[PDB]
Design an enzyme around this catalytic site. Sequence first.
Site, short mmCIF file in Angstrom:
data_model
loop_
_atom_site.label_atom_id
_atom_site.label_comp_id
_atom_site.label_asym_id
_atom_site.label_seq_id
_atom_site.Cartn_x
_atom_site.Cartn_y
_atom_site.Cartn_z
N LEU A 10 0.84 -1.20 0.00
CA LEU A 10 0.00 0.00 0.00
C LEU A 10 0.88 1.25 0.00
O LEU A 10 0.64 2.17 -0.79
CB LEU A 10 -0.94 0.02 1.22
N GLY A 11 1.87 1.27 0.89
CA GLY A 11 2.81 2.38 1.04
C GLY A 11 4.11 2.01 1.72
O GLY A 11 4.29 0.87 2.17
N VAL A 12 5.05 2.97 1.77
CA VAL A 12 6.37 2.82 2.40
C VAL A 12 6.59 3.99 3.36
O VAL A 12 6.77 5.13 2.92
CB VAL A 12 7.53 2.64 1.38
N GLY A 13 6.55 3.69 4.65
CA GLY A 13 6.74 4.67 5.72
C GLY A 13 8.19 4.80 6.16
O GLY A 13 9.10 4.28 5.49
N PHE A 15 9.55 3.78 9.37
CA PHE A 15 9.95 2.54 10.05
C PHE A 15 9.82 1.27 9.17
O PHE A 15 10.30 0.21 9.57
CB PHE A 15 9.18 2.38 11.37
N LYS A 17 7.62 -0.70 5.37
CA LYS A 17 6.49 -0.86 4.45
C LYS A 17 5.16 -1.13 5.18
O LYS A 17 5.14 -1.52 6.35
CB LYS A 17 6.77 -2.00 3.45
N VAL A 18 4.04 -0.94 4.45
CA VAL A 18 2.67 -1.21 4.90
C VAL A 18 1.94 -1.92 3.74
O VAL A 18 1.76 -1.34 2.67
CB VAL A 18 1.92 0.00 5.53
N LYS A 33 1.24 -3.00 9.10
CA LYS A 33 2.34 -2.05 9.18
C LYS A 33 3.57 -2.83 9.65
O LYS A 33 3.60 -3.30 10.79
CB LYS A 33 2.04 -0.90 10.15
N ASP A 127 1.69 16.18 13.46
CA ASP A 127 0.61 17.09 13.14
C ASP A 127 -0.33 16.45 12.12
O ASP A 127 0.12 15.74 11.23
CB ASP A 127 1.16 18.40 12.59
C1 LIG Z 1 -0.29 3.00 2.36
N1 LIG Z 1 -1.01 3.37 3.58
C2 LIG Z 1 -0.59 4.46 4.23
O1 LIG Z 1 0.35 5.16 3.86
C3 LIG Z 1 -1.30 4.80 5.38
C4 LIG Z 1 -1.15 6.07 5.92
C5 LIG Z 1 -1.84 6.42 7.07
C6 LIG Z 1 -2.69 5.51 7.68
C7 LIG Z 1 -2.85 4.24 7.15
C8 LIG Z 1 -2.15 3.90 6.01
O2 LIG Z 1 -2.26 2.67 5.44
C9 LIG Z 1 -3.56 2.30 5.39
N2 LIG Z 1 -4.32 2.50 4.31
C10 LIG Z 1 -5.60 2.11 4.30
N3 LIG Z 1 -6.37 2.31 3.23
C11 LIG Z 1 -5.79 2.63 2.08
C12 LIG Z 1 -6.39 2.23 0.89
C13 LIG Z 1 -5.80 2.56 -0.32
O3 LIG Z 1 -6.33 2.22 -1.52
C14 LIG Z 1 -5.46 1.30 -2.20
C15 LIG Z 1 -4.63 3.29 -0.33
O4 LIG Z 1 -4.05 3.61 -1.51
C16 LIG Z 1 -4.93 4.38 -2.34
C17 LIG Z 1 -4.03 3.69 0.84
O5 LIG Z 1 -2.87 4.40 0.73
C18 LIG Z 1 -3.13 5.68 0.15
C19 LIG Z 1 -4.60 3.36 2.06
N4 LIG Z 1 -6.15 1.53 5.37
C20 LIG Z 1 -5.40 1.30 6.52
C21 LIG Z 1 -4.08 1.69 6.53
BR1 LIG Z 1 -3.04 1.41 8.06
#
Ligand SMILES: CNC(=O)c1ccccc1Oc1nc(Nc2cc(OC)c(OC)c(OC)c2)ncc1Br
Length: 243
Positions: A10-13, A15, A17-18, A33, A127
């Site tokens: 989903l993403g890379v923080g 600490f 990846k997620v 996470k 923040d």
């Molecule tokens: C990649 N996720 C994060 O960077 C993220 C950031 C703050 C809080 C939670 C995070 O991860 C989370 N992200 C979701 N739903 C979600 C759903 C998405 O659609 C694919 C998405 O990409 C469009 C997304 O990243 C933008 C998140 N839920 C819980 C968490 Br836990």
Amino acid sequence: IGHYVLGDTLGVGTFGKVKIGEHQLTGHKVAVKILNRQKIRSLDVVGKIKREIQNLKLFRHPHIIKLYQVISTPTDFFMVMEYVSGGELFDYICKHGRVEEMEARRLFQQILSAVDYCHRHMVVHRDLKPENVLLDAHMNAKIADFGLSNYAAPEYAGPEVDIWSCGVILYALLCGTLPFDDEHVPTLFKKIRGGVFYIPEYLNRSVATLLMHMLQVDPLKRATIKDIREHEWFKQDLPSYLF
Ligand SMILES: CNC(=O)c1ccccc1Oc1nc(Nc2cc(OC)c(OC)c(OC)c2)ncc1Br
């Protein structure tokens, strides 16, 4: 890989990846996470993250992402959390436009109650930014906690900076655009420090008085959680379960 099959990133923080985690039997999707233990030890925030997770475990608010379990391995930390389907709120705003008055008030009440809950139940902070505000399948706002695990206001301060951010999110909801936006970087801060933001024809006057207070330059003169809770527009059709 563990407990839940691990899929797409989903993403890379900071600490680590997620990723997404589907259930091997039911198919239930969770958000994992992955936090690197060596990276935490190198950043000297071992006790900070441990106490944050302990505080997040006792968290019970429906408009905040809940933490189910934390699996520990000698290499990483696995924070199993709820997966929010519909991504970011601001992604929907720029792709669809502006939200209706009584619908924007519904989302705002869900956002503000969550922000207030975070400041009175969390040890450490980041923040609030529109990145934290996510949207689920039922089109409800789901905010991520302001911790180390995951267009600033004029002017250390915690809730004061977030109230201004709530004002930015509120503006974007019933306008489609940001209150302060300029291609030139120095003049962008000049509009913020001056509090100069455009007010549209379709915008209500009761909400305009609230927005003017929330987006106030001086943090001492800026609206508080109590000030918004006592406002007429915010009080209208507000659910009893919050606060
Ligand atoms: C990649 N996720 C994060 O960077 C993220 C950031 C703050 C809080 C939670 C995070 O991860 C989370 N992200 C979701 N739903 C979600 C759903 C998405 O659609 C694919 C998405 O990409 C469009 C997304 O990243 C933008 C998140 N839920 C819980 C968490 Br836990």
